[PDB]
Structures are given as C-alpha cells and as structure tokens.
RNA sequence: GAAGGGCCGCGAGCCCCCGCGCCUGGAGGAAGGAGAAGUCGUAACAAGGUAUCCGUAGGUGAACCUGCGGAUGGAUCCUU
RNA sequence: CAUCCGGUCGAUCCUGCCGGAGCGCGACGCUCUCCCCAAGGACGAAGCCAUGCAUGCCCGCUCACCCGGGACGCGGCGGACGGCUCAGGACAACGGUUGCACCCCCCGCGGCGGUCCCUGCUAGCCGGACACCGCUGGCAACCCGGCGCCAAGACGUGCGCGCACGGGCGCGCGCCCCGCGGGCGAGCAGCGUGACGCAGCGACGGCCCGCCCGGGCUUCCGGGGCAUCACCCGGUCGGCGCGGUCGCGGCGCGCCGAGGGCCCGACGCCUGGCGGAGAAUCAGGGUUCGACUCCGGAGAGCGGGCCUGCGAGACGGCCCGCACAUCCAAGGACGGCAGCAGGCGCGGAACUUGCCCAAUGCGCGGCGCGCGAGGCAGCGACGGGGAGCGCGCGAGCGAGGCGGGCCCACAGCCCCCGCCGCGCAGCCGAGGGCAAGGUCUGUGCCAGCAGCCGCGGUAAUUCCAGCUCGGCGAGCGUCGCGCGGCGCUGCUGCAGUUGAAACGCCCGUAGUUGGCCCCCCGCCGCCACGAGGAAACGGGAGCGCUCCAGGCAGGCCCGUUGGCCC
C-alpha cells in the first residue's frame, strides 16, 4: 500500500489485548521496538486500561512523559511503547513492581514482584550472528550481546543483569526444563519439556508435561525456557495448571457468590 | 446415474447443462430476460402515456379493461399498463407522467387482460389508490 | 461509525401458516388470560421457548456427562431455574421439554403482581406498571413484561411514592 | 519505463495475460550502461537509497595471476571475444566474462621468474596478457579481472586464432 | 527440453456436494541435471529451487526407474 | 556545466489497414402469437362416411390429395 | 428447527406445471402516541462538478511588530498511513500452506563504534550564502525579475588507530557419501592472504549490524460461464552467456536448440466479475448473493512518463498526449469531489452547502496544536427493540407543557426532580385456497373484481356503498429479487413401455468402471488425533442496560472477569 501502515483498526488488533468492539474505530498501534505487534501489549493498555491509572490517552501521555514509567530500567515516554514477555514493569511513585508474564487464559497478566525480583529480565536466544568479524546473540526484546560464552547453543535462556547490560545466568534448553509458552493454543502455561522432535526440514515440535499431568505439544519457538529444575521467576498464582471448562465455570460461579 | 468415486466432474457438468432445462432457471439466470424486460430489474419505472386505450377482456369475462400506452423513459420502450380500480382512467390524461409496476406474475399476464404485463401505480406523481379513495 | 459495529436481531418467529384457526383461537385465550397487547408478544415467547427446547433436544442426544453436556446443561437448567420458567424440583435436562408459552408468561411480572394479589386483573396490572406504581427491590419499572426472577419474586411490591403513605396527590387527588 | 514485471509476458500455454495493475516503481529496470573502454563512474540511487556505482568509461582494472600469486593494476589495451555480441567487441564495451588484453608492463618483472608455467610467461613479453573481466562495471563500478589460465586460455586462444 | 523435464502430478480433488473425488493433473517443469538418466514414465523427486527459468522452479533430486512400460498418485 | 543537437530506450496520441464483440436505421419480403368475431370448405375424432399415423417424393385456394416402404398407437391377440 | 393446500373432469387416479402459504431486502402507496438502537447516491452514470473545507506540526536559526512569546523565512519530520470507490483484472486478484542458501526497509528498540596515505589543513572549532528581508521592479491575471545585508543541527569542506576499511576482484574443503561447528536438513558464514578502490562521517560526530514492522517475489492446493470456441502459443518452451533489478527469473538482449499447453476442455470469447472472512434462506445434503462495515487486491476523467523519497511509477506531486472544461487585459494562465457536505445528470431509489477535536487513534513536541480520520447533533416507518390508546368503580397516569438538576467540547437527548397537566389506529380483507356476512342498497357480462380457480347477462356469499365481522397492528398493503416451497434439477433423491425423454444399428479411442486371489511392507488415497493459523460474526460461560434489542460489563471480587468452540 505504498508504504508502512501507521494506523490500526480496533477489530484488527490482537485478542490477548482484549479491546472493546466499540468506544473507537481505532486501537493503539504499538510503535516498533523491543517487542513485535502480534506478541506485545502497548503501554497505554497497561496504564489506562488495566491498572486504570489514567482516564484518557492525553492523561496517559502526561504521566508517561514525566519519567515515572520504568520499563527495563529505561524512562520510556511514549504511550504505545511495546511491552513483552518477562519485561519488568516498575512504577516507582506508586511503589508497585511487576513483570509482564503470560497468563493461563493466554493473555498477558502483570505479575507483582519485589525489588530483589526486579532488576533481572529473563531472555531467549533466537540466533547467533557473526556480523562485523563479532559473535552476537538474539533475544525476543531485540537485545543484542557481543562475545557469548561458546557453551550457549540455541533456544537457550539468558538473564540480563540490566545494570551492565550483560547476561547473568544461562539455562541449557533440553528435556527437563520448566518452560512457559509464549504463543499458540497452549499459552501462559508453565510445565516441563518431555520431548523435542527435530522433524528435519522445518517446525521442531516439543511436547511438554504440566505439573498436574496435562500433556500439551507446541512449536519450539512458542516455548520460552523459564528456569532449569526450578521456576527461577515468580509463577503467576495458577502456575499454568490450566482449568477444564467446567472448573472455569465453577471458579466464576464461586467468585460471583462471594461478591 | 453416474456412480464412481472419481465421477464428480461428470456429475457437476450434467447439473450445469441440465439446470437450464427448467424454464424458471432460464428466465432468472440466462440474462435474456434482463435485457428484454421493459423494467430492467427495476421494481417499477416512470413513463409518459401516449394513448389511453381499453383492452377487451379474454373469454369468458366481457369488459373493456382500461389501459394506457406508456413510453418508459429509461429504455424508450412503449408498453401497455392496466389502470386499476373503478373509473380511475379519468385521472390519467395523455402526455402525463405515470409510474408503471408489475402485475405480480413476474412479467406474465393476470386473468382476462390479454397481453397486459403491468399496472399503473402513480399518475402525475400521486398514487392511483389514493385518488380513487379521494385521499388526495 | 462504530455504530455499524452494534448487532441487532429479530426476537420473534411468525407462524408458517397464517390462518390456522385452531391456533388463532388458542392464541386468543392466551392474550385475554395474560393481557398481551399483540400476537407478536405471543410469538416472542414461542421463539424463546423454541430455542431453549432446541438446545435441550441437542443436549439430550449428546451422551450423558459428555463434558460439553455437563457444561451446557448446567447453564441451561440453572438459568431457567433462576428465571423460574422451570420449577426447581425437576433439575434434569429431560424435563425442559414440556415447557409452554404460559411458563414464560408466568414470570412476566404482569402475572407475578396478579399472583401475589397485588393486582386484581392482568389488564389492571399492565395499567399499573405503565404508571410507575410497581417495584421490584424498590425499582420503579415501566415494563409490563419485566420477566421477574425467583429470588426477586418476594421484593415485588407497590412503589415507595405511589400508594402507601406517599405524596398521594398528583393525578386525581391533586384536583 | 523499462520494467522487469511478469504481467506483460504470456502464460506458459502462450495465453495472453490480462493487466491487473499499472506499472510499479518497485518493478523497474534501468537503461543498460554499456561500459565503453577509452583507447566516468556515475552514481545512481537504488531502492533503499543504496547507491550503486555505474562505470560508463573505465581505463584500467586490478587484473591478477593466481597461480603465480601476483596481482597488479594494469591498463586495458583492447577488448577481444565478447561471447554474446560481436558488436560489443568492436565497440570495446566492458561486461563480465569479457576477454581483454591488459598491458604486460606491471606483470613484466615476472618474465625473469620461471616455473609459473611457460605459456603465461610468453604472454609477458608481447604486451598482450589475455584477461577476463570479473566484475559487472554497471553494478559494482569496477573492472577488476583475472588472467586466463590453463585450458580456458587454450580455448580462448583457439577462438582468437588468426583463421 | 535441454537438461529439463516436465513432471506430471496426478492427484484426486474432492468435490464436496457429490461425495466423490475428481482425478486431476498438474504439470511441473523441473531441471534434470546430466548426472541422473531419465526416460519418460519414470518416478522422479523434484525439490524447490530459486526460480531457474520462467517455468522451472524445481530441480530433480532422485530418479526411481520403472519397468520398460495409468494414474498413479505419488 | 545551462539552452540546445544527435542516437537509442520507454511510450501516449493520431493516421491507415485488419480482426473481434456489441448495438442499431431500414423500402420490401416472410413468419408467429393474442381480440369477439368474419369469409371458404370440412381435414381429424364414432370403420368420422377413402382406418389413422410415420418417413420420403410430387401436386393443389385451404384444410389437404396421391405414389412407395413401414407401424398399430386399428376396426384383426382367432381358423389346411 | 424432516408439514403442504387451491386449479385440467361429468366424476376419478396420475404426470405436470400454474397459483398460494413462510422468511429475508429494497422501492411505492396509505398511515405513524412516545422512547432506545441502527442502514442510509452501490445497483450495465469509476457521468460531470459551482462553492466551502478535508495536513499539518515544529523551533535547529531568531537584530521588524510584541518580549521571552518570537512572526516571516530557511531547516526538520510527516504528508506513501488514513478517508473514498469497485472501473479494470478469470491459472490474475483472493484464500489456506511454503520458501528467500535470490532479496529491500523509515521509525523505534538493542548492540557496535579504531577511518589509509600524502600535499595543503584551522580543529578553542572552517568557509561562502540562500531565503525571509532593505531597496528597485514588471505582469490583466497567473507568475516572479534584479541589487545589496545576513543565521543555522541548512550547504560544501574537513584533521582523525597502515586489526586503516565500503562495494566489488583473486587464491584459499574434499577421494564414495554421511556421521562436529559461528553455524545449518543442506559448502553456509566469517576470516587469512593477496591486490584494487579511497567508499564512510567528523564543524552539537556517527557509519554499520541485529530485531521489529512493512514490503517485493515465491512453493503447493483451492480459484466463473460459453464447444453456436478444438486445437493453441511463437519470448511462446528449454539451454547458454551477458545486462538490468532490491534481488530472482525471457525480465531484457544476443546466441543455440524445438519445445511448451491441451476433450482431467487447452486456447478463444464473454461477463449487469473485486476476492476472502462472510450474508440470506434454512431437517439433512444444499441453493443463492459475495457493492459496502474487517482483511488482502486495484484505481483516482482516460492513457503514458517521471521526480522527491526509506518507501509513490503518488494524482487534495509534476510533465505530456487525449477527452471535457475555466479566467482573460487576447499575450497568456489553470483544472481534476471513486474525501466530507452540496449541486447537476441519471434512475424505482439513497441525508446537513451543521458543530467540533472533548473521546478514539494518527501525525508533529514532552508539558498542545492539527485532522470532513472520527465524535456530536440534524434528516431518516432500511430495519431491529421496548412501551401506549386505559384501568377500575375507585384511584390514577404518559403524551405533553414549564423551571431546576444532570448530561454534553457546547448545546440538546435520555434520565431525575418539583409544578400543572390536553389518549389517540391504521391498512388489507369476509365464495374457495385462507380467518371472517348466506346483511341491505346500487349496478345488470356494464362498471369493475380476481396471484389462482373464478365473480358480474335483474333474488351478485366476489363489484359499489352502508352495516356488522375477521387478520395483523403503529404498522399494514403493493411491486421487484433471493431462498424455502421443489424429490420441478434429484450426491442424498427425479424421470425416460404409453404422461416429456433410450441414440436405427455395430465397431471403437479418451473417459468412467472392473471376478476371485498372498494375513504382516513400500508408496498411496482413506481415517483418527496433533500442532499452527486475524478479529468481527455465528454458537456459547458469567453479568438485571428498568425489561429488551444490547454491551462487555461489573463488584470490594479465579492473578474479579471478558472463558471456550468455529
């Protein structure tokens, strides 16, 4: 269409975002950045529509321009900033610290953390590139790191210190790793890998066993290592056990009675 | 009939060729009717009445059904349309705008009016029914 | 316009044959008994019952305890039980079949006020609701076909500002 | 308006295709810059704004002798054997794969050297060492090539043979 | 053609209204490198490649020769 | 390095010539269908007063008539 | 969400249509007591357009007016998105599925940052100069001429790590292959070493690499009719070398072959052809429509060509031919509503030449402007929803009216108040289908009615009135269309002795179809379940918008929701 599409329609927006059909013909277009539009939530949704700090966009802009927002140690002044998996969302004036993890409904739920919990962002190695004569690695948030420990292979786990912009810890992707799923039918689910099938050609399919017993199979890329034999991050209360439809009705029915 | 797991093409071809055999499908989907219809796909059309004429009733009924010879403006095709209701031909005058709509038989003729495919509905921009009831 | 986005739907189904007299007579009885202004109100409840019974027909074919059977059976029986269209004793997918236009009409609130003696006649009851003199949980309702629920049956009562020591002046008394 | 679209072409069955869109700028082609050889490198702005160098007239290039590992700039004396059009040989146009006579003077010292073959050392005396251009001057803006070595030479000597 | 073959693909397409399939055919142009030897009527494997001609986007990987002399879905 | 000038490239438009699809004006000819009924016979239906009918050929105001080979849907399930 | 009924006869049983009966979506008639929602110049005119308006923002630089605000200018960023329409286009678009070891990309985000000599350089730091402007101007207009003053994060230069460094150019694995990587299913990358070239960018240093998003092509499958179109093509089909491109490829050009496509329908022709998600109708299997709401395509009167660009073959850019215009002072200039309003033409048909950025997003700016995107009203019986025209013998309303709140960008609307208080039905019908007069007049095969069968020729169940009565109801009738009816298109599931229809016969190629037969696998088709795939919609969980059509709300709350299915 002669160039990039700046606007984005409300109907043509991801379902993990949860826009309302009405209220606008437009939904926020996430400006290019650490996370991709399909797999990121703009900050305006997490600020005026989920923590409900601001009423409108204009309000959100003022409290974003003021350096109060803190994503990954950076001031961040734009409302449609992309936020993504394992991105620390710290709000300091309100003194609440959270990390944006996925949820068992498949949407992204802000997971409350401590000051000690904040300061580290877990990352996934996508590719190792030898450009400019130095080895670099690829993370989902577009972070690029020169001279990796040669032991790190692929689809591995990184933990940026976020203070020196260097990896702190590395988990090797193999059978036996607590993992959360960042895409697909199986999403926001923490369980541990049972098999990684190569399928020479394309699309490696890994099968993973949840704690309770649910076995679910998804693509390799959809996986995101969360730890080794321990979660290594705060697990959202449900620890991605994943409810049956009837149990979900009963959770809603019990909740309604209490209110 | 053709009965093979691999005979879908023949069965599709037979339906395509045989479907046109029913007269109503041919009227609806050939496209010859759309060119021919004095009202081309329209519910109705406006025209000027050149002559007020009466068409003798087909047997066994005996009557001078009152009709108008109207030249439809959209196609410049002259046509015959019945003026409905009792003594309502009086409202029609030659050289007067009229709106002509179908007789409900989809281009066919109804009852004893021979070769009349339409009825006037509005004369001089006023509905014929309203004039007969003296509403206007 | 996001106005285009708003969904609208017909809520009633008309009869396949318009002049079946046995039915036309049976309908007249329902209208006179339930004070229904038009046959459309009789058809709207027929449509509501049809869907409700079509769903329980589909559900009954599904094998017992078929996960979706358990999930959708509850939301049918339990929402009907709240509405009160079904008496709570039955509580099984077999007896949703056997409901009638009268069962829906029974909870209309025109009937509920006549049933508890608040309104002498359905014709009087419709007149009462349109003058804002009936309340459910102290809600001044202007709707004759409110479709009141089992729990909200007890709350149905005369309005605070209409007859029991209220202003009691605007209207005939004020003159 | 030169274009590299497939819309203008016929189908594999020879059926005329119908034109759905008007010419696009992304599907564009440019007038060939036949590189004349003197006996200027133009800059053009491509897609992405990348600038490709187009040599229009280029005097000399970095030719090379791989077996003897000696590579020096040399002057392009004359062009022989285009292999696509005889017209290009007599207009001295410079394309990749174009046999050319480079001046033997930069490589003159190796004449004293020996054991780097014998046929190639005979060419050193004449002023005519055969060399195929290896770089598309229209796209890369340079005419760097390689001296013909071994059987390729014998084929290109037989082609150039006085008959 | 010169170092190129046309591979006939035979497959069944299922028309939904008639609960029946249709035998259907598509012809794929492939590059037959001089290494393998191909005579007409022989099964070959063709792999996708950068377009190498207007019609050739596939290159023969293997030839399974058949006997000296139907519709076969491969 | 401007105006310009040349050779090619891309290519509008026009000008012929050609093909294609459509849409139309026709003196005059020839149908068909509808009106209520006129004129001339009576061809078919009762063996309809020459059983009809089919193919084909010819001839007549008109239905039609006639030859030649069929058919029975005929008026014959039947007679060394 | 498995239904029929009226009509050939003197009757009958059929075939078979005709007609009804249902549901949409638009036009027309007549009529609309109030509120809530909501479609709205698409329909062989992608015809033409008066006028108004739809893209600005910014301060890098600031010696007219006003103060810290700068106007104008130059500079930057955007104007390629959005809004609009469906003309073109039928192995095309478009859908699902692959690839790019054949690729381009602004922003943002994360890395990374060494910049050759040598002459002349200033690196506490370079020029000269343009616009605005001062002067002096022509021109009907449009348009702009000179001469001087003078700034930038503008312009051009430019010192700077000979592990200096862009592009491209050489030589750098194999011993039958495959069994490690910086890596890969893949010999790909990177580097070393030759030589070329001096690419960056440096006057508020940043190239470059990545990721993202958005492309460009691409693989497989699906992707209209017409045989009164049967053969077709001739860069057409392959090879090879060059060129061109962002790259790939007959993409272009030589050269060299002779292919390539087709009754499994090629090619030709035609379309009142944008496709999909979907919409209508609706046991099932289906039929029909795919203007428009989201997604992808295409286009800006009709063709071409370009420039600027990171991206446009851009038209609220330019240039040219064409077609139709406009103003003229007669020499010139200048259009482009398939943006939102509005007119004209056309048609059966389709709204205001409002108000506004307050929301929602986007552009620019970090402390706010701009937007006919939108929002808000106005018009609006496309439609959808919910209430009225009384109840009861006594009370009352709501429709109003008028003030106040509240609401709203501002009104208003709803709603809440006090205060008075004005209820009101149409449109089709009563012989049958098909519910409801064997009433009384007029009229006498007239007038008219009647989808259909039939009524009317003097005791008219059918016309014209009155009278009653039915049906639906603020709507009802009519006309056109699609579906159902319809098993009258038949895969399920039609019929062919006589109702319509077995070719006069026989051979026969494609096509279609093939006896029985091996338990054990290889490839099929097949079937089961996987992943992975936009929402809207549809189905569906919860939730009293007063009910409701709705909407995702809400309540001190599963990580309160907003599940799940397609």
Numbering used by the authors:
A (entry chain SE): 2 to 134, 136 to 261
B (entry chain SO): 3 to 138
C (entry chain SK): 2 to 176
D (entry chain SI): 2 to 40, 51 to 174
E (entry chain SM): 78 to 146, 150 to 154
From the paper:
Giardia intestinalis is a protozoan parasite that causes diarrhea in humans. The highly compact and uniquely GC-rich Giardia ribosomes possess eukaryotic rRNAs and ribosomal proteins, but retain some bacterial features. Using single-particle cryo-electron microscopy, we have determined high-resolution structures of six naturally populated translocation intermediates, from ribosomes isolated directly from actively growing Giardia cells. The translocation intermediates, with naturally bound tRNAs and eukaryotic elongation factor 2 (eEF2), display characteristic ribosomal intersubunit rotation and small subunit’s head swiveling—universal for translocation.
Structure B is a hitherto unknown eEF2-bound chimeric hybrid-like intermediate, where eEF2 is in the GDP state with a distinct density for the leaving Pi held by the catalytic H143 from Sw-II. The SSU body in B is slightly rotated: 1.05° compared to state C, but corresponding to a back-rotation of 8.9° from the D states. However, the SSU head is still highly swiveled: 17.5° compared to state C, and 13.3° on an orthogonal rotation axis compared to the D states. eEF2 domain IV is inserted between the SSU A and P sites (∼10 Å from the P site). We observe clear density for the P*/E tRNA. However, there is no density corresponding to the A/P tRNA similar to previous studies, which indicates lower stability of the A/P tRNA during the dynamic state of translocation by eEF2. We found a clear density of GDP in the G domain of eEF2, which is coordinated by interactions from P-loop (G1), G4 and G5 motifs, similar to other reported EF-G/eEF2 structures. A distinct density of the ‘leaving Pi’ group can be seen in the path of the expected trajectory for Pi release held by the interaction with H143. One interesting observation is that the Pi moiety in this structure is placed 4.7 Å away from the phosphate of the recently reported GDP + Pi cryo-EM structure of E. coli ribosome. This indicates that we have trapped a mimic of the post-GTP hydrolysis eEF2 intermediate on the ribosome closer to the completion of Pi release. In our structure, domain IV of eEF2 is extensively stabilized through interactions with the SSU head and H69 of 25S rRNA, in the absence of A/P tRNA. We conclude that post-GTP hydrolysis, SSU body back-rotation pulls down domain III of EF-2 via uS12, which in turn pulls back Sw-II with the catalytic His, thereby guiding the Pi release.
